[PDB]
Design an enzyme around this catalytic site. Structure first.
Site, mmCIF file in Angstrom:
data_model
loop_
_atom_site.group_PDB
_atom_site.id
_atom_site.type_symbol
_atom_site.label_atom_id
_atom_site.label_comp_id
_atom_site.label_asym_id
_atom_site.label_seq_id
_atom_site.Cartn_x
_atom_site.Cartn_y
_atom_site.Cartn_z
ATOM 1 N N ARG A 47 31.875 19.059 26.900
ATOM 2 C CA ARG A 47 30.574 19.604 27.191
ATOM 3 C C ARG A 47 30.226 19.537 28.679
ATOM 4 O O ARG A 47 29.679 20.493 29.228
ATOM 5 C CB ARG A 47 29.490 18.956 26.345
ATOM 6 C CG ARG A 47 28.243 19.817 26.410
ATOM 7 C CD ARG A 47 27.017 19.206 25.775
ATOM 8 N NE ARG A 47 26.147 20.328 25.422
ATOM 9 C CZ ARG A 47 24.826 20.361 25.596
ATOM 10 N NH1 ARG A 47 24.176 19.328 26.141
ATOM 11 N NH2 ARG A 47 24.159 21.455 25.234
ATOM 12 N N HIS A 51 29.208 22.682 30.933
ATOM 13 C CA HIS A 51 27.912 22.754 31.617
ATOM 14 C C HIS A 51 27.976 22.827 33.151
ATOM 15 O O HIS A 51 27.155 23.487 33.788
ATOM 16 C CB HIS A 51 26.993 21.616 31.145
ATOM 17 C CG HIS A 51 26.257 21.954 29.889
ATOM 18 N ND1 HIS A 51 24.989 21.488 29.608
ATOM 19 C CD2 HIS A 51 26.592 22.778 28.867
ATOM 20 C CE1 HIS A 51 24.594 21.972 28.441
ATOM 21 N NE2 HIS A 51 25.541 22.769 27.977
ATOM 22 N N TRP A 190 29.110 19.497 13.568
ATOM 23 C CA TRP A 190 29.498 20.795 13.033
ATOM 24 C C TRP A 190 30.586 20.681 11.986
ATOM 25 O O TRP A 190 30.800 21.624 11.205
ATOM 26 C CB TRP A 190 30.002 21.703 14.157
ATOM 27 C CG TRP A 190 28.968 22.131 15.144
ATOM 28 C CD1 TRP A 190 28.187 23.266 15.087
ATOM 29 C CD2 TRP A 190 28.591 21.448 16.356
ATOM 30 N NE1 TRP A 190 27.382 23.338 16.188
ATOM 31 C CE2 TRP A 190 27.603 22.243 16.987
ATOM 32 C CE3 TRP A 190 29.019 20.265 16.981
ATOM 33 C CZ2 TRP A 190 27.016 21.889 18.211
ATOM 34 C CZ3 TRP A 190 28.426 19.897 18.191
ATOM 35 C CH2 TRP A 190 27.431 20.715 18.796
HETATM 36 C C1 HEM Z 1 25.295 29.753 22.920
HETATM 37 C C2 HEM Z 1 25.942 28.862 23.684
HETATM 38 C C3 HEM Z 1 25.859 27.344 23.407
HETATM 39 C C4 HEM Z 1 24.772 26.637 23.036
HETATM 40 C C5 HEM Z 1 23.342 27.139 22.766
HETATM 41 C C6 HEM Z 1 25.176 25.259 22.900
HETATM 42 C C7 HEM Z 1 24.338 24.239 22.533
HETATM 43 C C8 HEM Z 1 24.691 22.927 22.303
HETATM 44 C C9 HEM Z 1 23.796 21.855 21.925
HETATM 45 C C10 HEM Z 1 22.271 22.007 21.650
HETATM 46 C C11 HEM Z 1 24.532 20.736 21.798
HETATM 47 C C12 HEM Z 1 24.057 19.327 21.406
HETATM 48 C C13 HEM Z 1 23.791 18.470 22.644
HETATM 49 C C14 HEM Z 1 23.398 17.072 22.182
HETATM 50 O O1 HEM Z 1 22.391 16.936 21.430
HETATM 51 O O2 HEM Z 1 24.083 16.073 22.523
HETATM 52 C C15 HEM Z 1 25.911 21.061 22.138
HETATM 53 C C16 HEM Z 1 26.965 20.182 22.137
HETATM 54 C C17 HEM Z 1 28.259 20.448 22.515
HETATM 55 N N1 HEM Z 1 28.705 21.629 23.074
HETATM 56 FE FE1 HEM Z 1 27.642 23.443 23.000
HETATM 57 N N2 HEM Z 1 26.526 25.151 23.212
HETATM 58 C C18 HEM Z 1 26.962 26.406 23.538
HETATM 59 C C19 HEM Z 1 28.254 26.689 23.914
HETATM 60 C C20 HEM Z 1 29.245 25.759 24.138
HETATM 61 C C21 HEM Z 1 30.516 26.034 24.794
HETATM 62 C C22 HEM Z 1 30.874 27.424 25.363
HETATM 63 C C23 HEM Z 1 31.243 24.895 24.816
HETATM 64 C C24 HEM Z 1 32.654 24.678 25.434
HETATM 65 C C25 HEM Z 1 33.634 25.587 25.407
HETATM 66 C C26 HEM Z 1 30.445 23.856 24.175
HETATM 67 C C27 HEM Z 1 30.810 22.547 23.944
HETATM 68 C C28 HEM Z 1 30.070 21.553 23.358
HETATM 69 C C29 HEM Z 1 30.580 20.264 22.937
HETATM 70 C C30 HEM Z 1 32.021 19.736 23.022
HETATM 71 C C31 HEM Z 1 29.376 19.539 22.374
HETATM 72 C C32 HEM Z 1 29.332 18.135 21.782
HETATM 73 C C33 HEM Z 1 28.892 17.151 22.879
HETATM 74 C C34 HEM Z 1 28.737 15.748 22.320
HETATM 75 O O3 HEM Z 1 29.116 15.501 21.157
HETATM 76 O O4 HEM Z 1 28.245 14.854 23.077
HETATM 77 N N3 HEM Z 1 29.254 24.434 23.776
HETATM 78 N N4 HEM Z 1 25.952 22.405 22.456
#
Ligand code: HEM
Length: 293
Positions: A47, A51, A190
């Site tokens: 993430r 970001h 997920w």
């Molecule tokens: C529409 C686009 C996206 C949205 C709205 C989105 C939104 C989110 C949100 C709300 C979380 C939870 C954050 C938290 O509460 O800790 C998250 C986690 C995460 N995102 Fe996305 N994301 C998007 C695209 C992506 C992309 C493109 C990647 C990488 C290729 C990615 C990788 C991750 C990963 C690995 C986590 C888990 C982080 C953790 O467990 O600490 N996301 N995302």
């Protein structure tokens, strides 16, 4: 017009130097296994790489991975970046041991290392990002909102020069980790594995029985009886007929998803960077497992 950012190799460094950095990251991932109820730091590092790259604007080449601007308060305090401080903290001792690596190289390499150690595809990676000053830090608001639909997702990703296939592939990273209510106002994983990189995001979208519910932060998310969740933006990938076809493709072809994710993820991490014709080729790092380490 667009800013020009030319990759410049950390002085005298080669593949072997970066493999050492990769190894230190991979070793620490193994060591600090307790983080986030034993998910480990893999997902948050992915993430963090996304970001720090995802602020990019193709129109003027602001944001992007090149400058390593997350180290500055405006960006680390971005509400869209809540929770990423954990990733940054993880990387601190790595940066201390290898102070010669640029911040953008480190943030991006953290992502590559995490994907690979979590048994994901090899992601070729190029060095040469160069730290830029605090005034180059992009403003908050360039990262996407989760409470939106497919039209929003499609339009959002056009700014990062990503097409439908690239968008769907990149989103498969949501196999990893979880949402945390205190960070983002969403709660739950997920899928089941969450620290093993697979096509499980797509299988789950297609195969689980989803219910649109309100979580404890009064936000809507899609919930399954298995204890999984999908953001509105995730679920939009099966509401839109073009996205749906691609979801089905990845759900039914692990290798294709791996190949496509690797290309889109490298692209994301490289957006905004000009590589000299005589720049080194992209590096493909060996995993700890491949090295017998
Ligand atoms: C529409 C686009 C996206 C949205 C709205 C989105 C939104 C989110 C949100 C709300 C979380 C939870 C954050 C938290 O509460 O800790 C998250 C986690 C995460 N995102 Fe996305 N994301 C998007 C695209 C992506 C992309 C493109 C990647 C990488 C290729 C990615 C990788 C991750 C990963 C690995 C986590 C888990 C982080 C953790 O467990 O600490 N996301 N995302």
């Amino acid at each position: 017009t667009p800013l020009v950012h030319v990759a410049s190799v950390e002085k005298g460094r080669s593949y072997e130097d970066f493999q050492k950095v990769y190894n230190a990251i991979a070793l620490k991932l193994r060591e600090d296994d307790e983080y986030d109820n034993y998910i480990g730091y893999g997902p948050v590092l992915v993430r963090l790489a996304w970001h720090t790259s995802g602020t990019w604007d193709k129109h003027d080449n602001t944001g992007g991975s090149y400058g390593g601007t997350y180290r500055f308060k405006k960006e680390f305090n971005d509400p869209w970046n809540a929770g990423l401080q954990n990733g940054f903290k993880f990387l601190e001792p790595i940066h201390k041991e290898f102070p010669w690596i640029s911040s953008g190289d480190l943030f991006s390499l953290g992502g590559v290392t995490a994907v690979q150690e979590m048994q994901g595809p090899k992601i070729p990676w190029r060095c040469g990002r160069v730290d830029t000053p605090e005034d180059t830090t992009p403003d908050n608001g360039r990262l996407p909102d989760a409470d939106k639909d497919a039209d929003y997702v499609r339009t959002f990703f056009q700014r990062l020069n990503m097409n439908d296939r690239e968008v769907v592939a990149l989103m498969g990273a949501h196999a990893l980790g979880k949402t945390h209510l205190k960070n983002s106002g969403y709660e739950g994983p997920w899928g089941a594995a969450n620290n093993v990189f697979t096509n499980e995001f797509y299988l789950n979208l297609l195969n689980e029985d989803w219910k649109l519910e309100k979580n404890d932060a009064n936000n809507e998310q899609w919930d399954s009886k298995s204890g999984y969740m999908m953001l509105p933006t995730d679920y939009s990938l099966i509401q839109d007929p073009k996205y749906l076809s691609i979801v089905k493709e990845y759900a039914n072809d692990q290798d294709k998803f791996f190949k496509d994710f690797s290309k889109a993820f490298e692209k994301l991490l490289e957006n905004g960077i000009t590589f000299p014709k005589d720049a080194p080729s992209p590096f493909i790092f060996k995993t700890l497992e491949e090295q017998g380490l």
